[PDB]
């Protein structure tokens, strides 16, 4: 596996590349003006050292926020309508408060708040002009919870960490099926309409396991309340040497390589930086040549549907997440 | 003046100079092992994007790191002992955090919270170790209220803004003597032995007002209380029109250079870039060809006297704050 420094000049590489292209109003290259092509922009930018480039970023966002603290346009993907609304506000939350944007990450984090469920602490899928049914998933809450982290709402995400052992407690099928939505009351939703993970296929969507594992072992280092370091590491046993090879091989695997890396730091254990390991060089293998990173296109392109852009922006932070971890953690093991 | 970009490019060489001479403990090159000579790394390389550099600062603060969430040793300048005790504490706090280290953030936080005086807000001078009659200065008081508002308590930051109040309040002479420490009951200190800066003399010490300015600021956009941005403007008046023209040229200049361009993204007052823009253009000015600071040192050297390497640290955190905020700046007033 290549090693964190060079996990780290992968991340550089995307980076530069996303700022060279930066729009003036601080948007960044999407072929579609849209939030969720740009919500990771803050925070990538920003852990590159591109803070002027983040800073312009969060001149964009601080544009489009509403009185409410929410940015509810423009949003066309429906993921970001009612499977997790949330996980746009979560990344640009922790963007602005790490930027220093003090005013911009109160507004935002008041209004995640707004949509906590004080009986369960899981947060709603649907945004406020979005109907439903008061359902909430693991990501929303995730993201969430990680974002009560860096904003100080310590006991926000100690509530998040509940829903998430409930959720994975009451699971009905857990060698088969990862259903990750519970009801307004608590109850794990099994409807054909709630995201379902499919454990023994290579179907994606391990974000809505990964992402919990990153959160919670967030949430342990933050507290060193073992009850999230169990949690964490039964959900990375479970992606580990439960779920298909596709949970580390997906395109939404570098949660979960984050999680390991920074188990890694945290535990030791080998195989967490094996995951890890792993998980980066895979990420750093997919890199298009000109930088950036696309499921289709391979070309010296100008500008990334919505979608490979926000993918771009995410692994610039995620192997910049595993690589810090990672090298930290052979300081302090090896 | 200088561009934004070129103050950037001031940062980056820096930065770059100081991880190519970091060592394999995570330690900064510092001719003695001092945490005065590394406290402002963390935040600092966070913010030239050099993240497995300022975590393995991360890892050498956790080694020292007591169980009372202090690092009481290794310190040797009095200044770090008995006149700004927790300046050192503030600067990890804030770079621990950034950098997702929750726990370390959560220990030191907490630590510099118990020396926080309860009825006055400001934060005691001297250490634990080190005897002393309980006085409160507005350093330690300003770094700790900003450390405070990147944890999130931010009831404690508004404490510490109420303490500074209190203190510019009670200037017996302000127009010839800026008395920077109160006592145990918030009286303003004139003592020999309590630190004063003498404000119609080129004779440095103009970060006990300059730091103030700077974190008022940060508090206001935080709050949007208007009373913080009332008593940064006061400040800021007070050091350009009253105070010797040394305040804007003093290697401690960098603090008001800061406060400047923050209030000139949130103002957009020309006098608050010209401020900045001045003092950035200054200290970039001043880098040597290697990228290092010093007071003396002109060659190409491995390591640094403590002072010139925590100086080095904090002109990269200033030109890229300066650089960050002016560039806002413009694209919003501009
Ligand atoms: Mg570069
Ligand atoms: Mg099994
Ligand atoms: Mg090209």
Wanted: glycine letters at 10%.
């Amino acid at each position: 596996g290549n090693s964190p420094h060079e996990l780290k000049n992968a991340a550089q590489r995307a980076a530069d590349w996303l700022v060279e292209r930066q729009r003036p109003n601080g948007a960044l290259p999407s072929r579609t003006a849209v939030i969720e092509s740009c919500y990771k922009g803050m925070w990538a930018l920003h852990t590159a050292g591109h803070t002027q480039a983040a800073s312009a970023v969060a001149d964009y966002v601080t544009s489009l926020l509403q009185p409410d603290g929410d940015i509810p346009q423009p949003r066309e993907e429906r993921y970001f309508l009612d499977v997790h609304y949330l996980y746009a506000n979560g990344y640009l939350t922790i963007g602005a408060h790490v930027l220093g944007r003090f005013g911009l990450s109160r507004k935002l984090m008041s209004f995640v708040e707004t949509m906590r469920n004080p009986a369960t602490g899981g947060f709603r899928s649907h945004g406020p002009a979005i109907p439903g049914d008061g359902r909430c998933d693991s990501v929303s809450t995730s993201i969430s919870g990680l974002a009560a982290l860096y904003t100080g709402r310590v006991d926000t995400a100690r509530s998040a960490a509940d829903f998430l052992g409930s959720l994975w407690v009451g699971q009905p099928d857990r060698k088969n099926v990862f259903h990750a939505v519970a009801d307004a009351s608590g109850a794990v939703l099994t409807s054909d309409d709630a995201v379902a993970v499919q454990v023994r296929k290579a179907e994606g969507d391990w974000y809505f396991i990964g992402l919990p594992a990153f959160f919670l072992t967030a949430l342990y280092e933050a507290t060193e309340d073992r009850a999230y370091l169990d949690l964490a590491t039964d959900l990375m046993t479970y992606m580990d040497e439960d779920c298909d090879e596709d949970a580390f091989v997906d395109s939404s695997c570098g949660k979960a390589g984050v999680a390991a890396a920074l188990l890694y730091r945290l535990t030791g254990r080998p195989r967490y930086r094996e995951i890890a390991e792993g998980i980066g060089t895979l990420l750093c293998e997919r890199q298009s040549p000109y930088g950036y990173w696309s499921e289709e296109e391979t070309g010296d392109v100008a500008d990334l549907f919505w979608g490979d852009l926000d993918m771009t922006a995410e692994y610039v932070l995620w192997l910049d997440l595993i690589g810090r971890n990672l090298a930290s953690g052979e300081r302090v093991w090896a």
